Amino acid sequence: ETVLSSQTCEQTPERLFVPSCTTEGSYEDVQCFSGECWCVNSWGKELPGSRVRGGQPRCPTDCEKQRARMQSLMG
Amino acid sequence: ETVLSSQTCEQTPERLFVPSCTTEGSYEDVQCFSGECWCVNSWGKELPGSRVRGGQPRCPTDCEKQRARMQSLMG
């Protein structure tokens, strides 16, 4: 069970990155640190390529997720 | 002459990066923008690999420049 659980343990975070999250406690759609920002899903994994230099990335909608999934399956 | 001058024109800077510089006007050894910092020489070219995530990079001394030059010439 633990070696299944470690398949998604690819996390070497910085010591001081605070994860901002909602009043009920679900993860905020944008996470920012050190002038960088990115989109995360409901779990704490950033979406690949969503990291932007400036700030406030637009988190992808249903169409972009469907396009990425169909392209990857077409691969 | 101009096509010789454009050999070092590899510059697509951001609109709002202000270059901080000395009282007499020589370039400061560290230039910072948007949470990054880097070392530049007397001309306005950043030294490759000197960009750091946190801030305040130690600009290389004589030994590091000599080591890089000797390694590159050994190449």
Curated annotation (Swiss-Prot), chains A, B:
It comes from the Eukaryota. Residues 6-59 form the Thyroglobulin type-1 domain. Disulfide bonds join C32-C37, C39-C59. Iodinated on tyrosine residues by TPO. Sulfated tyrosines are desulfated during iodination. It is found in: Secreted. Specifically expressed in the thyroid gland. Monomer. Homodimer (via ChEL region); occurs in the endoplasmic reticulum and is required for export to the Golgi apparatus. Homooligomer; disulfide-linked; stored in this form in the thyroid follicle lumen. It is linked to Thyroid dyshormonogenesis 3: A disorder due to thyroid dyshormonogenesis, causing large goiters of elastic and soft consistency in the majority of patients. Although the degree of thyroid dysfunction varies considerably among patients with defective thyroglobulin synthesis, patients usually have a relatively high serum free triiodothyronine (T3) concentration with disproportionately low free tetraiodothyronine (T4) level. Acts as a substrate for the production of iodinated thyroid hormones thyroxine (T4) and triiodothyronine (T3). The synthesis of T3 and T4 involves iodination of selected tyrosine residues of TG/thyroglobulin followed by their oxidative coupling in the thyroid follicle lumen. Following TG re-internalization and lysosomal-mediated proteolysis, T3 and T4 are released from the polypeptide backbone leading to their secretion into the bloodstream. One dimer produces 7 thyroid hormone molecules. Belongs to the type-B carboxylesterase/lipase family. The cholinesterase-like (ChEL) region is required for dimerization and export from the endoplasmic reticulum. This is Thyroglobulin. It comes from Homo sapiens. The chain holds residues 600 to 674 of 2768 of the full protein.
